[PDB]
Amino acid sequence: SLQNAEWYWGDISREEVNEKLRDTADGTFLVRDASTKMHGDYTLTLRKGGNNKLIKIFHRDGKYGFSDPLTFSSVVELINHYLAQYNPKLDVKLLYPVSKYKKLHEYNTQFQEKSREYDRLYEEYTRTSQEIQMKRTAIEAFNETIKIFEEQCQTQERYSKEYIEKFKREGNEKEIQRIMHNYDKLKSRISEIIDSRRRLEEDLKKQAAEYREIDKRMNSIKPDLIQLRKTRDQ
Amino acid sequence: SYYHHHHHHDYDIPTTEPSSGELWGIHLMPPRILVECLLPNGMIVTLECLREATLITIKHELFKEARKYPLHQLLQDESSYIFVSVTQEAEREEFFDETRRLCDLRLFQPFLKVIEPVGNREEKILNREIGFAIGMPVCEFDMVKDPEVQDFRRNILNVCKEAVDLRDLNSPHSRAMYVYPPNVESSPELPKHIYNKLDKGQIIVVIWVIVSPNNDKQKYTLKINHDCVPEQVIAEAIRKKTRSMLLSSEQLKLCVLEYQGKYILKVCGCDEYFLEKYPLSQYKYIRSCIMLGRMPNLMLMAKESLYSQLPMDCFTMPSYSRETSTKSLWVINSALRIKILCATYVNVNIRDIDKIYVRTGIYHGGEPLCDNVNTQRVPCSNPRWNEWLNYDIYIPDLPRAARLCLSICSVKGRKGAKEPLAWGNINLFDYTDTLVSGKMALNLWPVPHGLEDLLNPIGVTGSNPNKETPCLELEFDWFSSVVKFPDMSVIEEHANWSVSREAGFSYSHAGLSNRRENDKEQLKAISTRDPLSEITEQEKDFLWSHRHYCVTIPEILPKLLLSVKWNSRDEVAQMYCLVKDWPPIKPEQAMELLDCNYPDPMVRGFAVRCLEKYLTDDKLSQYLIQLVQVLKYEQYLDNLLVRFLLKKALTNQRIGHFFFWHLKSEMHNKTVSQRFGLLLESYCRACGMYLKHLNRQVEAMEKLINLTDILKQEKKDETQKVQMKFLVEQMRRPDFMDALQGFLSPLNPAHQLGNLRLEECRIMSSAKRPLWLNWENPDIMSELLFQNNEIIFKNGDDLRQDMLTLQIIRIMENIWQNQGLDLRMLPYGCLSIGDCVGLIEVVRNSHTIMQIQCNSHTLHQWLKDKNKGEIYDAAIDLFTRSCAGYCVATFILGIGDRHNSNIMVKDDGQLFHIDFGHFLDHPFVLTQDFLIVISKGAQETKTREFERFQEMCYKAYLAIRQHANLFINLFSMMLGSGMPELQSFDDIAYIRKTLALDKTEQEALEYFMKQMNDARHDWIFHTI
């Protein structure tokens, strides 16, 4: 074991280790190839506190370490001691290593076509959400319309209740009966508006429900997506 | 731009040596409608109106036809009433302006109520304009019941008063300075390669004057040193008509003096005025004229005829103008512990029980503690936990910006034998500096596409405005009393003290705390790194040590700041104190401090000052997209940065215009709809009589959105020709003629759109139906001297990515020209107005490479046509020059899709890429075609010319590389808009590769070359 162990990945850069360490215990580690090279430098990325910490492993003349007195020289011997000593704010040791484990044509074409539908479901999902919110805000407009025509009844009993008696005596009634026609359409008209809203209400509740289903399938694709993605690269 | 980037290759001086729809459901009301009118007499008379009918005329008809019904003496004249109805924003609306057409009121169902102006505020009620502009009725705010919202609305007027005062202070000139800012570069110094277009040092500049009651033009050609204020330019024009054989010369010298300041110059053809003592060549028009082989044409014009049309005087404070017991935070003993209670529901299928738990974390961008899930224990059904969660952090050690992040989520491991849902975020602190406690119900947001990162702390802080969503009920500890963050007085004490403690040096077993430093502090080398560089534990600590030495190099601040132990109350207090009197840094460096790595009020507050002082209105106008983007990470509604932006925007209308569109374009976007809605209101309330022009641009864009909604979708998937039948008809209609004729271009408000050229506007041929519209320029000096106006209205593609790319190219170009030499890019105009709705400026006289065919050499022959003989040499100077810019830039920004119908060539010889959209990674260009045009005709690459091309590309690449940072930061600020190519720093990493960055200078130049003399090589598709 020397320039080629479990945790030596080298060929990878900052972004890749970043995602490999995602959500792991205080001590998960690997070593990397550093940016600027003097024929070679190395970087250890330790897990502590909920974050990725970058630590520079130095060369200089031919001995290794983290700081001024560089002792452990063989790259591996440095990790072999482990982080308690070098600063007490890093008290945990190096627990988890990382390590490694078109012929495989078939076991990826599922990632093509299950992800086909997750990029098709997120669509159905987005569209429905906007569409629901439209129906919500239309219902709002309906009640509000309903509240106007209703208030138009008030504006008619008053104004015509004190004339359903005045015209009753004026020698000439008969006008009062071509008035009721208007009330008949008014109340006939409100009923339509109430139905129009109702039909929309029992279209929303069934549009809403539909959305829950589009979500349900999505949260059940999600985890199965991550496993193929990971049966692929490794 | 001005002249459509068309170079005149000849000027070696010597001349004399929701959704739309009008009516809910229906996209377009029928030529005629039955609109029911509800009268105050109590009777619905149903009235037949043509859709274009004005309200003045509906009223007339209603009242004429109403006296045919009962109770008609029970009337009131006619004009006493004013209609009210319900618009499809669900609100009742008084329709005070009775010019408004029936097809234009956003009615819900065709009915109008007749009432009486109770409210009697015809004036204040016409802040219905404010709602229109914002799009969202003003009073969804009036009914909010959140103290921060109501506060903001009140407190933000300070800014509006102040800004409205500044404008009128210095009566008439400052008003004009505001309405018409000087359009001016930020360095007065001319790059030497422009000097050498005026190798005399001077320029010929025609100065027209209008003489007839119906316009008559006089010239006066004039010639003057590029660097000469307009004051003086007016003089030399006086001394030219006035010159006479009776006029001596102290007779002329005096009376020039006496008339020099009674006139004003104006760019001919648009609304651009030279209102300031600036070097004549500092104005973009001028420099741009030098650049295109163009004679400046200015218009002399009396100051007093400009000042007569400037009527903004009125600003009115609106209707909404009208101590307990606390413990200082760190008195609080023992750790924070948040109680998780219960979510009400969750969208899991239940036949798949990878069960359900709440993941939580305290955060500061990246977290200040080990973060912890609660037990999985609950198997949905009634998702409940009742448990307190213990976080290892003293409550005293909570940073000011500290907040809590949570999600409901699921993962895996379960294959073999080995070991999401909805997220929400909360400010541990009030806007009033309270640390929250008690009952908290949080509606959570949906998980955004792609991001399966489990916790999403970049998503906004706030409960979900939509309460038909899973909702997580919460409990924070409650101490004897209300707990507040300590005063700034107190913190500065602690800072002082626990450094007087520091001089108890004793080597110890640690390395962070340590303070001289020898010559080997040369870690000014780290100050020079780009902001994504990554700082090692050794380095982070090195910095906190020699922090008190850092003041001597101001620009380390970003890195030092990312080295503070943000969970140490000691370290933060000490940091606070350094930030206090830190030497200020260049604006392009302060900006970084407004991204989401630097969330701390003190720090961001500092950046805002560095901006107040140093950043010029030019640079603002430029990096505006980011600044508007970056408000999204401000923790509270009322902060320093808004008070900044908003003040600027009321102070300089050219900024204002875009400040407004950039905010309006995301109003559909609920995560940010109210912060922006709120912002937008205060701005309109305070923007003067510009609101009226804005409203007209809005009016017009809606008509446009609607029209295209029928051209796709609402069937109209007919023969191309049929669709055109519809467009032509529909544009002729009088509602549309009004709506879409004579308003300011959103792409450039200095650009008046007049009447349409109906016989020039047509539907382009894309799936999405892009309307190609042409307007007349209604300027007096328009068609000669300037232009006729073409824009694309495009409704379906998300234009933000294109917007940013075009920003970045401009900047790039800007760098290469100021470094001297000189690759001309075409940052064409692009503006996103909505949910994938936008405008693109037509660059007249360009054709796709994949048009020019209908020859491998004859691209070079097409160029020798259009460009005759001698002129022809500069077309290669131009083509070669532009190809570099796009080679270099295209490579850095990583644009694939680089086929010949994406690249356009313009007649003068210019190249320019269009239709970007797709970003970094999500080789190079050089096809033979281009490689043939460079090297004027030949087939032999080892050419004299191709060699020069390499120097341009080498010199250019490295220029950008020096200016990495600006670019890393410009991209950095973007990470909070819905843009699906910029969600993580991970994403930005691409351009960190492309400019080598990690390697040396010399090394990066080698790598790029390793990229340059490569590439090499049916054409619509590709085969063998």
Residues of A in contact with B535 (CB under 8 A): 54
Alpha helices in B797-936 (DSSP H): 800-818, 849-852, 858-864, 872-892, 928-933
Contact in structure between B698 and B106 (CB atoms under 8 Å): no
Taking CB atoms and an 8 Å limit, are B510 and A88 in contact across chains? yes
* B369 to chain A, closest Cα gap in Å: 6
SS3 for B665-677 is CCCCCHHHHHHHH
Peptide bond before residue B822 is cis, with ω within 30 degrees of 0:
yes
Taking CB atoms and an 8 Å limit, are B347 and A212 in contact across chains? yes
B323 inside 8 A of chain A by CB = no
Alpha-carbon span B555 to B128, nearest angstrom: 48
* B858 to chain A, closest Cα gap in Å: 43
**B391: amino acid identity, one letter:** Y
Residues contacting B797, CB < 8 A, separation 6+: B768, B836, B838, B917
Residues of B in contact with A226 (CB under 8 A): 411-412, 452
The DSSP secondary-structure symbol of B466 reads -
Contact in structure between B88 and B64 (CB atoms under 8 Å): no
Alpha-carbon span A212 to B204, nearest angstrom: 70
Taking CB atoms and an 8 Å limit, are B42 and A152 in contact across chains? yes
Task: Find where tokens 């100051």 sit.
Answer: B303
Tokens of residue A4, six digits: 């080629």
Contact in structure between B374 and B332 (CB atoms under 8 Å): no
Residues contacting B859, CB < 8 A, separation 6+: B849, B852, B905, B929, B930, B932, B933
The distance in angstroms from the start CA to the end CA of chain B is 41
Task: Find where tokens 């609101």 sit.
Answer: B691
Dihedral of the alpha carbons of B744, B745, B747, B748, in degrees to the nearest 10 = -50
The DSSP secondary-structure symbol of B434 reads B
The DSSP secondary-structure symbol of B381 reads S
- Other beta carbons within 10 angstroms of residue B150's beta carbon come to 14
Mutation for B interface: A193, A215, A224, most B CBs within 10 A: A215
B419 inside 8 A of chain A by CB = no
Cα–Cα distance list, B1007 to B204, B756, B954, B1001, B1016 (Å): 46, 52, 11, 10, 17
| A-B C-beta contacts closer than 8 Å | 147
Alpha-carbon span B909 to B913, nearest angstrom: 14
Which region, left, alpha or beta, applies to residue B1016 given φ > 0 means left and ψ of -120 to 50 means alpha?
left
DSSP output for B529-590: S-TTS---HHHHHHHHHTHHHHTTSGGGHHHHHTTS-TT-HHHHHHHHHHHHTPPP--HHHH
Chain Cα centroid distance, residue B66: 52
B206-210 and B297-302: which strand pairing?
Answer: parallel
Residues of A in contact with B999 (CB under 8 A): 35-36
Tokens of residue B562, six digits: 């990312």
Q: Which of B70, B348, B541 sits opposite A219 (nearest CB)?
A: B348
Alpha-carbon span B381 to B676, nearest angstrom: 38
Q: Which of B70, B89, B367 sits opposite A51 (nearest CB)?
A: B367
Alpha-carbon span A69 to A60, nearest angstrom: 11
Helices vs strands, H then E, count in chain B: 33, 32
Alpha-carbon span B802 to B14, nearest angstrom: 42
Taking CB atoms and an 8 Å limit, are B989 and A15 in contact across chains? yes
The distance in angstroms from the start CA to the end CA of chain A is 22
Contact in structure between B843 and B912 (CB atoms under 8 Å): yes
Alpha-carbon span B858 to B62, nearest angstrom: 69
Which of A17, A148, A6, A10 is CA-nearest to residue B42?
A148
Tokens of residue B1018, six digits: 């049916």
**B974: amino acid identity, one letter:** M
Residues of A in contact with B43 (CB under 8 A): 156, 182
Q: Which of residues 353-412 of B touch A (CB under 8 A)?
A: 354, 361, 366-367, 369-371, 410-412
Q: Exposed, middle or buried by CB within 10 Å (0-12, 13-18, 19+), for B260?
A: middle
Instruction: Express the helix, strand and coil content of chain B in percent, nearest 5 each.
Output: 35, 15, 50
* A53 to chain B, closest Cα gap in Å: 6
Taking CB atoms and an 8 Å limit, are A14 and B534 in contact across chains? yes
The DSSP secondary-structure symbol of B136 reads S
- Other beta carbons within 10 angstroms of residue B325's beta carbon come to 7
Which of B952, B930, B826 is CA-nearest to residue B193?
B952
> At the fourth CATH level, which superfamily is domain B123-168+487-687?
Phosphatidylinositol 3-kinase, accessory domain (PIK) (1.25.40.70)
Mutation for A interface: B112, B347, B445, B709, most A CBs within 10 A: B347
Tokens of residue B646, six digits: 């908003």
**Domain boundaries for CATH 3.10.20.90 within chain B:** 1-122, 169-309
Residues of A in contact with B467 (CB under 8 A): none
Alpha-carbon span B221 to A10, nearest angstrom: 69
Taking CB atoms and an 8 Å limit, are B412 and A227 in contact across chains? yes
Alpha-carbon span B652 to B656, nearest angstrom: 6
- Range A1-101 classified under CATH 3.30.70.260: no
Alpha-carbon span B86 to A139, nearest angstrom: 12
| CA dihedral (A112, A116, A117, A123) positive or negative | positive
Alpha-carbon span B681 to B636, nearest angstrom: 17
Domain A105-234 maps to which CATH number in 3.40.50.300, 2.40.50.100, 3.40.50.1370, 1.10.287.1490? 1.10.287.1490
The DSSP secondary-structure symbol of B526 reads T
Chain Cα centroid distance, residue B771: 23
Contact in structure between B196 and B250 (CB atoms under 8 Å): no
Residues of B in contact with A49 (CB under 8 A): 367, 369-370
Alpha-carbon span B54 to B36, nearest angstrom: 15
- Geometric angle at alpha carbon A24, from A20 and A30, rounded to 5°: 50
B320 inside 8 A of chain A by CB = no
Residues contacting B574, CB < 8 A, separation 6+: B495, B498, B499, B547
Which of A121, A119, A115 is CA-nearest to residue A229?
A115
Q: Which of B40, B347, B412 sits opposite A223 (nearest CB)?
A: B412
Domain spans, chain A: 1-101, 105-234
Alpha-carbon span B795 to B454, nearest angstrom: 34
Contact in structure between B267 and B780 (CB atoms under 8 Å): no
Class of domain B1-122: alpha beta
Tokens of residue A185, six digits: 């359409």
Which region, left, alpha or beta, applies to residue B820 given φ > 0 means left and ψ of -120 to 50 means alpha?
left
Taking CB atoms and an 8 Å limit, are B42 and A159 in contact across chains? yes
| CA dihedral (B751, B757, B758, B764) positive or negative | negative
Alpha-carbon span B470 to A206, nearest angstrom: 18
Instruction: Indicate the CATH number for domain B169-309.
Output: 3.10.20.90
Residues contacting B659, CB < 8 A, separation 6+: B624, B628, B645, B646, B648, B649, B683
Alpha-carbon span B638 to B158, nearest angstrom: 12
B139 inside 8 A of chain A by CB = no
B32-38 and B44-50: which strand pairing?
Answer: antiparallel
Which of B568, B519, B580 is CA-nearest to residue B541?
B568
Phi, psi of B784 (to 5 degrees): -85, 160
Alpha-carbon span B869 to B881, nearest angstrom: 19
The half-sphere exposure of B715 on its side-chain side, counting CA atoms within 13 A, is: 8
Contact in structure between B404 and B361 (CB atoms under 8 Å): yes
Taking CB atoms and an 8 Å limit, are B452 and A222 in contact across chains? yes
Contact in structure between B476 and B439 (CB atoms under 8 Å): no
Residues contacting B324, CB < 8 A, separation 6+: B481, B482
Tokens of residue B420, six digits: 């999401």
Helices vs strands, H then E, count in chain A: 4, 4
Which of B139, B126, B181, B136 is CA-nearest to residue B650?
B181
Alpha-carbon span A174 to B150, nearest angstrom: 58
Chain Cα centroid distance, residue B596: 18
Alpha helices in B630-753 (DSSP H): 640-651, 653-664, 673-686, 691-711, 720-732, 734-739
Breaks (C-N over 2.5 A) in chain A follow: 82, 101
| CA dihedral (B442, B443, B449, B454) positive or negative | positive
Alpha-carbon span B808 to B947, nearest angstrom: 27
Contact in structure between B110 and B34 (CB atoms under 8 Å): yes
Taking CB atoms and an 8 Å limit, are B19 and A134 in contact across chains? yes
The half-sphere exposure of A18 on its side-chain side, counting CA atoms within 13 A, is: 11
- Other beta carbons within 10 angstroms of residue B305's beta carbon come to 10
DSSP element (H, E) containing B428: none
Taking CB atoms and an 8 Å limit, are A137 and B18 in contact across chains? yes
**Nearest-Cα residue of chain B relative to residue A163:** B71
**B96: amino acid identity, one letter:** F
**Domain boundaries for CATH 3.30.1010.10 within chain B:** 688-844
Domain B845-1024 maps to which CATH number in 2.160.10.10, 1.10.1070.11, 3.40.50.2300, 3.30.1330.20? 1.10.1070.11
Alpha-carbon span B269 to B779, nearest angstrom: 6
- Other beta carbons within 10 angstroms of residue B360's beta carbon come to 20
B482-484 and B326-328: which strand pairing?
Answer: parallel
Q: Count the residues in chain A.
A: 234
- Other beta carbons within 10 angstroms of residue B813's beta carbon come to 18
Q: Is A81 helix (H, G, I), strand (E, B) or coil?
A: coil
Domain B688-844 maps to which CATH number in 3.30.1010.10, 3.40.50.300, 3.40.190.10, 3.10.580.10? 3.30.1010.10
What is the crossing angle of helices B691-711 and B653-664, to 10°?
40
Instruction: Express the helix, strand and coil content of chain A in percent, nearest 5 each.
Output: 55, 10, 40
**B993: amino acid identity, one letter:** K
Task: Find where tokens 């009223």 sit.
Answer: B59
Alpha-carbon span B321 to B150, nearest angstrom: 10
Tokens of residue B841, six digits: 């400026």
Architecture of domain B332-486: Sandwich (2.60)
Mutation for B interface: A219, A220, A221, A232, most B CBs within 10 A: A219
Taking CB atoms and an 8 Å limit, are A66 and B535 in contact across chains? no
**B896: amino acid identity, one letter:** G
Alpha-carbon span A110 to B930, nearest angstrom: 42
Contact in structure between B654 and B616 (CB atoms under 8 Å): no
Q: Exposed, middle or buried by CB within 10 Å (0-12, 13-18, 19+), for B526?
A: middle
Q: Which of residues 73-92 of B touch A (CB under 8 A)?
A: 74, 86-92
Tokens of residue B776, six digits: 């007349």
Residues of B in contact with A129 (CB under 8 A): 446
Q: Is A169 helix (H, G, I), strand (E, B) or coil?
A: coil
B427 strand-pairing partners: B403
DSSP output for B179-196: HS---B-S--SPPHHHHT
| B186-223 residues labelled b (16+ CB within 10 A) or e (exposed) | eeeebbeebbebbeeebbbbebbeeeeeeeeeeeeebe
Which of B825, B838, B804, B823 is CA-nearest to residue B622?
B804
Alpha-carbon span B434 to B844, nearest angstrom: 58
DSSP output for B827-853: ---EEE-SSSEEEEE--TTEEEHHHHT
Alpha-carbon span B81 to B83, nearest angstrom: 7
The DSSP secondary-structure symbol of B486 reads P
Tokens of residue B16, six digits: 């004399």
B422-427 and B272-273: which strand pairing?
Answer: unpaired
Q: Is B93 helix (H, G, I), strand (E, B) or coil?
A: strand
Contact in structure between B73 and B57 (CB atoms under 8 Å): no
B999 inside 8 A of chain A by CB = yes
Contact in structure between B228 and B245 (CB atoms under 8 Å): no
- Geometric angle at alpha carbon B427, from B455 and B406, rounded to 5°: 20
Contact in structure between B409 and B347 (CB atoms under 8 Å): no
The DSSP secondary-structure symbol of A91 reads -
